[PDB]
């Protein structure tokens, strides 16, 4: 009696307006170094949280899970699940979005002011 994620990254999520990016790495949610935001490994899957400030003092949340053309099944399945868990942790307030390489929504592309970039490779599968 409860089912609360104690993952350090959940505690940091959505605290303030901005962009947070994590990479699925062997069944774990791992932060991307902020100097690397926007360079996506096509062999990987990622989870992005866009926090917008509302008048009300509260934050608006858009959760995006990005799937690279060569990411393995464990990675895309984990990005999806991590998205569900983060939304839940945030009281169901995030709006979820599936982003596929080459077909991303305009809003998502719009988060990367110097233009999102794709790069081959990535971390090995957790299987």
């Amino acid at each position: 009696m409860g089912s609360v994620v104690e993952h350090p990254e959940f505690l940091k999520a959505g605290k303030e307006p901005g962009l947070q990016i994590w990479r699925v790495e062997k069944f774990d949610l791992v932060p991307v170094p902020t100097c690397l935001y926007g360079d996506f490994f096509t062999g990987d899957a990622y989870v992005i949280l866009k926090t917008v400030q509302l008048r009300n003092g509260n934050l608006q949340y858009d959760l995006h899970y990005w799937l690279g053309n060569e990411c393995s099944q464990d990675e895309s399945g984990a990005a999806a699940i991590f998205t569900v868990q983060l939304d839940d942790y945030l009281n169901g307030r995030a709006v979820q979005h599936r982003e596929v390489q080459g077909f991303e929504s305009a809003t998502f592309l719009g988060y990367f002011k110097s233009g999102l970039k794709y790069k081959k490779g990535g971390v090995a599968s957790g299987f």
């Binding site: 993952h7 069944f27 099944q73 399945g77 999806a80 839940d88 599936r98 957790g126």
Partner: protein, 368 residues
């Protein structure tokens, strides 16, 4: 097998049990969900293939009917065999993830939890809905799963990670029904398939040579005027039979239940009915994410036909996408494997400590 604590994944079906280790990409064991007991004497019992081979002196039973457990002692045998014979582990040493059907009765969810902790002493367990695990395996959180196995088919709309119970539809029409039907129409062709041993043969004809026609009437035609669609099949004895339009009429029963003397809607219209029961605002996301899952979705041509039939039911501008992964026979199991492997899952299990405090009803608060 075992990272730190090695979790196990059990996917129990009406016809087959799929079991393995969290973190593998596939089930280690796949065996028939059958329990055989002596017709007269030795208490004693057999499971799976072995029960089948000694059927002549055993009473065989299926503990899961239409995805729901109807015999708990036999279910416990399936489980004991799974751990000791198939995976070769001591259950008291591992967290176990189990799967369940959509709308599983409350009492059944309690009983699974009870057996795990009290009969097998698992240190931890979790129950997950099969359809939701397939959606996860396909890297999605919203979509509609059409899950069809040996005893039941379900259409399960899911949004942002959770099933929408009110819109789930069940169809007691699945693989077994299809096998039986292939028996009856192969018989009508001039052959004779009516025995238990023959059923097995037919199941195999169904799995190797059946297919879904894109256009049923055009195909009946091609079949009637040409010999082009025919195929030969070798029975265990060396005799060769010829299968014709039976190849596609068998699975046609999925789209036309009247062929089995059933009054219900076929899988395409059931999928459509589930979508129309959901909020108009998520329908676009359901139609564009129709995930097929289960062994009965393995017929060649089924995706193309589901695409055609749904495209005809929905407004022409609606974008339809049928997703039918090559591994869909094991999608449920793979989803379970991924979920149980997550660093953030540790917290989701029901621990022995929770069970000793609340008893079996803890399952309604911990697993939704």
């Amino acid at each position: 097998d075992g990272e730190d604590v090695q979790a196990l994944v059990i996917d129990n079906g009406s016809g087959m049990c799929k079991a393995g280790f969290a973190g593998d990409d596939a089930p280690r064991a796949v065996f028939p969900s059958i329990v055989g007991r002596p017709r007269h004497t030795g208490k004693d019992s057999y499971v799976g293939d072995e029960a089948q081979s000694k059927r002549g002196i055993l009473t065989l039973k299926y503990p899961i009917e239409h995805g729901i457990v109807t015999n708990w002692d036999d279910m416990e045998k399936i489980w004991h065999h799974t751990f000791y014979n198939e995976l070769r582990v001591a259950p008291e040493e591992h967290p176990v993830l189990l799967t369940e059907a959509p709308l599983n009765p409350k009492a059944n969810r309690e009983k699974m939890t009870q057996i795990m902790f009290e009969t097998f002493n698992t240190p931890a367990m979790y129950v997950a809905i099969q359809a939701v695990l397939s959606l996860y395996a396909s890297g999605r959180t919203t979509g509609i799963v059409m899950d069809s196995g040996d005893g039941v088919s379900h259409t399960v709309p899911i949004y942002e990670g959770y099933a929408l119970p009110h819109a789930i539809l069940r169809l007691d029409l699945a693989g077994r029904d299809l096998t039986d039907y292939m028996m009856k129409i192969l018989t009508e062709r001039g052959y004779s398939f009516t025995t238990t041993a023959e059923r097995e043969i037919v199941r195999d004809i169904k799995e190797k040579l059946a297919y879904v026609a894109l256009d049923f009437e055009a195909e009946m035609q091609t079949a009637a005027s040409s010999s082009a669609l025919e195929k030969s099949y070798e029975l265990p004895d060396g005799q060769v039979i010829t299968i014709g339009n039976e190849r596609f009429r068998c699975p046609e029963a999925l789209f036309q239940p009247s062929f089995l003397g059933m009054e219900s809607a076929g899988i395409h219209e059931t999928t459509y009915n589930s979508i129309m029961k959901c909020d108009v605002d998520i329908r676009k996301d359901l139609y564009g994410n129709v995930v097929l899952s289960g062994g009965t979705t393995m017929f060649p041509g089924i995706a193309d036909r589901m695409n055609k039939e749904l495209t005809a039911l929905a407004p022409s501008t609606m974008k339809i996408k049928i997703i039918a992964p090559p591994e869909r026979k094991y999608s449920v199991w793979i989803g379970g494997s991924i979920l149980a492997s997550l660093s953030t899952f540790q917290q989701m299990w029901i621990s022995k400590e929770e069970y000793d405090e609340s008893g079996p009803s803890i399952v309604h608060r911990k697993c939704f």
